[PDB]
Design a protein around this nucleic acid. Structure first.
Ligand code: MVM
Ligand code: MG
Ligand code: MG
Ligand code: ZN
Lengths: 153, 52, 61, 50, 39, 84
RNA sequence: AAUAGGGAACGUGAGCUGGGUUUAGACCGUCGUGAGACAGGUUAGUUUUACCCUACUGAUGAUGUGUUGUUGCCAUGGUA
RNA sequence: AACGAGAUUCCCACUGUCCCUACCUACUAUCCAGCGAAACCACAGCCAAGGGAACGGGCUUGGCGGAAUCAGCGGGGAAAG
RNA sequence: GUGAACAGCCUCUGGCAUGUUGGAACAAUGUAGGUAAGGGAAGUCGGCAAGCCGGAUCCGUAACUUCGGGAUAAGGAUUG
RNA sequence: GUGGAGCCGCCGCAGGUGCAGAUCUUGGUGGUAGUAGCAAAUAUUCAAACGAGAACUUUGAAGGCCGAAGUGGAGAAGGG
RNA sequence: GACCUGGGUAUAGGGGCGAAAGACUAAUCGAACCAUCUAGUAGCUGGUUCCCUCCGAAGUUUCCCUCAGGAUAGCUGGCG
RNA sequence: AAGGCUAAAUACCGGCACGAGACCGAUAGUCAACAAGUACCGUAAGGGAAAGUUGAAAAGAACUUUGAAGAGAGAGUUCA
């Protein structure tokens, strides 16, 4: 398919993709800000400590009602949350971002995450049950992702 | 459209519940449950002065 | 490896309730094999599903 | 009911056979556009009325 | 099978809880708070 | 008790499915039918519901013996065998 | 010591309470042929939602000073 | 007389109704993990006086004003239904 | 089993995972359950709420009365 | 720049001929918002297995609950 | 005990039924629901889609079961 | 007059076939261009939708890698 901003160093920069993966959008977007521009083997070591609640992920845009925590002072912010499902999937395919990279003959120990974006998926539906005999929808909000991994030289 | 465009049987809500006083269809069930009935405004409705 | 079928089939051939049946978890891939009723009666004869008798309700006091 | 007359269980035999998935090859055929059976009556969702 | 749950069933239904979700909300004069305003 | 706890006493059916029309309308207490009026001789159709004719006119069934009239008529009801 | 008078959408119902008024039940009196009427009387009578912004009360904070910490001064604002 | 989930007054005993509040437990609320709606919505949201459709948030003239926020809160939005 | 008892409480036979989820901490505010010295309705439209008495035995019983009732009246004493 | 098979000017003729509103109609999507919420009926815990993966499955051992007007064993009606 | 309850049957819209509240009659009752006559009538609210250029007012008379409206004149425009 | 018959010119929005249209072009046209009086609701009378388009051709992505799979990366098909 076609990405956004196909790479300027096209032989020596790798790329991956995942579509219609059931995570929240507002928790997959805001774990993607926190690793944007980070070296991969530190970013892989980052997302493990998110799920083990050692090193949080700050919420900068979608900060409605999010309770404070102390680990967010590293990122200059007061609110944080530890997504152990959202930082699972894009841990699970930074595995599959570099599994393509050395398949193209690239030294993976110099990769940094250049580009990453999250964009929503068609919201699949099921229904709730409310008062006075009314129905409202439980709408899941899944999301696509997209990423470019670039060696620095 | 000669005369028939009115083979959908309906009535107005008749009270200020929170919708317009346009005729709404009856029943339940299908997606044509409380939609707009005849009148020139509405989807699936009659036309203004249907030609003769 | 479900054993819910053996839990049901034993408590109609031992004439007992579903609770009281069954000790011995060591031959688990042996008692999961037999899903019949005639092949489940060998496991009583081999002593792998036992009766495990009734809880005590002494009328001493 | 389990006390049913004959003209019910030869009606229930008809609403049990026609509640069935499609064979897969007819989706491949020429000149159709159907891709899933939509008349599948699910026994808790949608009920018959006798 | 392989594609009997993943390519037969994924078109079968997948919009069947949207049997509208409601028929209108016929809640029938919920101004039960009798108010009567000073007469 | 007027509402949802009254629906729990809905247990015995009233309209079983009829024998001629086949429409779930055979009223069992009164031994008649809704759409066709079964113990009557004539078929209950009316003009006030102009669609209910359209559900059950000639042409909405199979027309098993008027696929045979509307084809034999256009040759004039021949009765002989054929020529070889 | 004094038991001063007042206002703030007749301060104050997503603060409460329902006693009276002011629905539908009912009784008496007077008026009316009658249905019913009665600032005449009595008894019985469902009180909805704050998660939005603001105000406020608390709580991390933010900028500017090179990073950072300790000890401090006080413009102001409150007031017994 | 009896009887009454009937209505009213007093007395005895009693008590947190109160003087005057305090403490303890459970389930919440709170925070994290996962799933995640609706109500409502011109644009939005600091105040005083003035005039004005005679009681503004937005105009006039003044007083003044910092990001993004959480737990509450029931004065206002002549709030919402 | 206890007890007059198919009352409540507990256990075996026979069932299930606490009712469409858990982990951590134990603020306000509620929700449900309690206790409180001294006073005892002063609260409030109102003794509403909560409390008090509650089973058995032996005593003991008034006004009134249609002579059946009031009545388990009230007021006590005992209870392992 | 996409697009892949039809279109426009001029003289005349004919219109279901032009949208910001109608608590418009159908359809779509936010803001609220990762917020409210997942709180009626006491309660789970340890090891092993199958497994890519276990607070929620199975199996055990223990702790419990319903407690014979049952959270048990069976039917009518209804469900098919 | 003027007691409670299952199934069968009867009574149908100006009609059923009522130990009487205008309750009940499929969440609908001071007259049920479904379809048509019917797109029922409305002196009454809500709306009524392109641009420029020229001219540009009226709330008064008389009469009306007229006072939220219409007729008549007045005032306006277009055509000569 | 108190008995009777009768083709033609004439009416047709149901029926079998047809032909044409200064029409409508998928929220239009009938409700229905498709498995529409179908899915669905209502005890019943009855109410009743949504939904047309790959390409010229299926030539519908063989094969290799990662992951349990969804899904990616290469390769390929096609002018695309
Ligand atoms: O449930 C309700 C109830 C309460 C409010 C609404 N309202 N009011 N405005 C509304 C706008 C939208 C939606 N609902 C609305 C509806 C119902 N009750 C109730 N309470 C008091 C009076 C009348 C009732 Cl019916 C029951 C009755 C018995 C006690 N338990 C609760
Ligand atoms: Mg100072
Ligand atoms: Mg469309
Ligand atoms: Zn019939």
């Amino acid at each position: 398919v076609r990405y956004s901003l196909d790479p300027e160093n096209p032989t020596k920069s790798c790329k991956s993709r995942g579509s219609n993966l059931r995570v929240h959008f507002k928790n997959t977007r805001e774990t993607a800000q926190a690793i944007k521009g980070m070296h991969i083997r530190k970013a892989t070591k980052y997302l493990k400590d998110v799920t083990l609640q050692k090193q949080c992920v700050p919420f900068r845009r979608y900060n409605g009602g999010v309770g404070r925590c102390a680990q967010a002072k590293q990122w200059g912010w007061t609110q944080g949350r530890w997504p152990k499902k959202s930082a699972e999937f894009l841990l699970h395919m930074l595995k599959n971002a570099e599994s393509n990279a050395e398949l193209k003959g690239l030294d993976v120990d110099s990769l940094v995450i250049e580009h990453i974006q999250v964009n929503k998926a068609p919201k699949m539906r099921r229904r709730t049950y409310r008062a006075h005999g009314r129905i409202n929808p439980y709408m899941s909000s899944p999301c696509h992702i997209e990423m470019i991994l670039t060696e620095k030289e | 459209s000669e005369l028939a465009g009115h083979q959908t049987s309906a009535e107005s809500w008749g009270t200020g519940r929170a919708v317009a006083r346009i005729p709404r269809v009856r029943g339940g069930g299908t997606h044509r449950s409380g939609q707009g009935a005849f009148g020139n405004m509405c989807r699936g409705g009659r036309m203004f002065a249907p030609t003769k | 490896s479900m054993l819910r079928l053996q839990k049901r089939l034993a408590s109609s051939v031992l004439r007992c309730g579903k609770k009281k049946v069954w000790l011995d978890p060591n031959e688990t891939n042996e008692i999961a094999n037999a899903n019949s009723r005639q092949q489940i009666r060998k496991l009583i004869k081999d002593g792998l599903i036992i009766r495990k008798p009734v809880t005590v309700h002494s009328r001493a006091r | 009911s389990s006390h049913k007359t004959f003209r019910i269980k030869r009606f229930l035999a008809k609403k049990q056979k026609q509640n069935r998935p499609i064979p897969q090859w007819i989706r491949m055929k020429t000149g159709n556009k159907i891709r899933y059976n939509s008349k599948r009556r699910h026994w808790r969702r949608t009920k018959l009325g006798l | 099978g392989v594609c009997r749950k993943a390519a037969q069933p994924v078109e079968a239904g997948l919009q069947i809880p949207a049997i509208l979700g409601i028929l209108g909300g016929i809640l029938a004069l919920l101004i039960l708070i009798l108010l009567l305003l000073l007469f | 008790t007027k509402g949802t706890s009254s629906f729990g006493k809905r247990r015995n059916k009233t309209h079983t499915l009829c024998r001629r029309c086949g429409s779930k309308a055979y009223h069992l207490q009164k031994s008649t039918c809704g759409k066709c009026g079964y113990p009557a001789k004539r078929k209950r159709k009316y003009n006030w519901s102009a669609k209910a004719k359209r559900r059950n006119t000639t042409g909405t069934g199979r027309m098993r013996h008027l696929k045979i009239v509307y084809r034999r008529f256009r040759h004039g009801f021949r009765e002989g065998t054929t020529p070889k």
